[PDB]
Design a protein around this motif. Sequence first.
Motif, PDB file in Angstrom:
ATOM      1  N   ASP A  59     -10.293  -0.878   1.830  1.00 16.91           N
ATOM      2  CA  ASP A  59     -10.557  -0.692   0.495  1.00 16.91           C
ATOM      3  C   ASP A  59      -9.168  -0.388  -0.921  1.00 16.91           C
ATOM      4  N   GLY A  60      -7.791   0.142  -0.095  1.00 19.16           N
ATOM      5  CA  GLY A  60      -7.114  -0.240   0.171  1.00 19.16           C
ATOM      6  C   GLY A  60      -5.762  -1.211  -0.726  1.00 19.16           C
TER       7      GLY A  60
ATOM      8  N   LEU B 177       0.000  -1.145  -0.446  1.00 19.34           N
ATOM      9  CA  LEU B 177      -0.789   0.028  -0.370  1.00 19.34           C
ATOM     10  C   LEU B 177       0.374   1.394   0.052  1.00 19.34           C
ATOM     11  N   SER B 178       0.269   2.249  -0.899  1.00 21.58           N
ATOM     12  CA  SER B 178       1.040   3.852  -0.325  1.00 21.58           C
ATOM     13  C   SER B 178       0.277   4.187   0.117  1.00 21.58           C
TER      14      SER B 178
ATOM     15  N   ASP C 245     -11.358   4.260   4.368  1.00 16.90           N
ATOM     16  CA  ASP C 245      -9.776   3.832   2.700  1.00 16.90           C
ATOM     17  C   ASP C 245      -8.768   2.779   3.058  1.00 16.90           C
ATOM     18  N   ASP C 246      -8.431   2.323   4.112  1.00 13.19           N
ATOM     19  CA  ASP C 246      -7.209   1.255   4.617  1.00 13.19           C
ATOM     20  C   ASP C 246      -7.924  -0.019   3.686  1.00 13.19           C
TER      21      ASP C 246
ATOM     22  N   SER D  71      -2.336   7.725   2.204  1.00  9.67           N
ATOM     23  CA  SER D  71      -3.795   7.554   2.113  1.00  9.67           C
ATOM     24  C   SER D  71      -3.273   9.658   2.190  1.00  9.67           C
TER      25      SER D  71
END
Length: 163
Positions: free
Chosen positions: A153-154, A125-126, A150-151, A128
């Motif tokens: 979903d990523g 992951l990059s 958000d985490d 947010s």
Amino acid sequence: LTEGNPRWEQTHLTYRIENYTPDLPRADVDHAIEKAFQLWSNVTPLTFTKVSEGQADIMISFVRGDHRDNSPFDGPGGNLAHAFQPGPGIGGDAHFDEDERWTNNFREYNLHRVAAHELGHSLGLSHSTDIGALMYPSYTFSGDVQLAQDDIDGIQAIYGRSQ
Ligand SMILES: CCOC(=O)[C@H](C)NC(=O)[C@H](CC(C)C)NC(=O)[C@@H](CC(=O)NO)CC(C)C
Ligand SMILES: [Ca+2]
Ligand SMILES: [Ca+2]
Ligand SMILES: [Sm+3]
Ligand SMILES: [Zn+2]
Ligand SMILES: [Zn+2]
């Protein structure tokens, strides 16, 4: 070979804590790291197994200053830790700045909170833009450490969901 970030093609990964920080008792470091893995494990089909000897997909260590990579640490404050994206060798590894005072409570800086962020990088992951997300580029401690939508979903965009 596709676009986006590199991911692990293996679903069952191993990790190893190479050295321990003298800031916290050994059990609190183990707990903080295990709980951090659990968070990401709850929403994906990924599983993590801790090994005590030999090489593992994700090596974790506490280091200070220049430590053989291109981003030497800066003493107390500033950068707290960094991690490598998935891949052979050094890929997925996480380095924590020992010059920081690591905690197991609400005072700066909570190890569990920072580990949760670093492992997100280790998994591909990059950052947010959501200030409520674990992957936000700056340290925040709300009082609890949990994944924001958000985490979730990523990470699911890469490895899919669980169950
Ligand atoms: C509120 C700002 O200042 C602070 O509270 C403390 C001192 N510093 C930071 O939060 C700095 C901020 C940068 C601007 C230097 N960020 C980090 O150290 C990230 C690095 C990273 O992305 N690692 O993967 C690690 C995570 C804990 C987010
Ligand atoms: Ca590795
Ligand atoms: Ca630092
Ligand atoms: Sm320290
Ligand atoms: Zn490093
Ligand atoms: Zn980061």
